[PDB]
């Protein structure tokens, strides 16, 4: 037998961080032909999206 | 008795593993793949598998 060992260090924050973020539109501006949505994706430092 | 394992505001419902929520009652969202399964549970299962 052989077991693959996880990195267990320097790979994940202990900081309370959201795993899955919902972004809701700042502006919508609905019209008869289309339905625009305008988002604002804030990615802080240490976050990679 | 108090240490939740996610415990880092990880999931959209940090305090439980919401396996499914009825979409008819659903208002905020957090349902995935066109059924009552949740975003958190879908992410967990897809990541594990």
């Amino acid at each position: 037998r052989q077991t693959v060992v996880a990195p267990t260090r320097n790979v994940t924050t202990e900081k309370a961080q959201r795993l899955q973020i919902r972004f809701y539109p700042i502006q919508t501006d609905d019209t008869s032909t289309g339905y625009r949505v305008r988002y604002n994706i804030n990615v802080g430092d240490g976050w990679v999206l | 008795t108090s240490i939740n394992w996610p415990g880092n505001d990880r999931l959209l419902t940090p305090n439980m593993f919401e396996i499914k929520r009825s979409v008819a009652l659903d208002t905020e969202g957090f349902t995935m793949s066109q059924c009552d399964i949740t975003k958190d549970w879908y992410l967990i299962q897809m990541a594990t598998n």
Partner: peptide, 16 residues
């Protein structure tokens, strides 16, 4: 920031 090397009862450490 606080580094808590306690094998029981760490801090939440929300941070930012």
């Amino acid at each position: 920031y606080p580094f808590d090397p306690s094998g029981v009862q760490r801090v939440q450490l929300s941070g930012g």
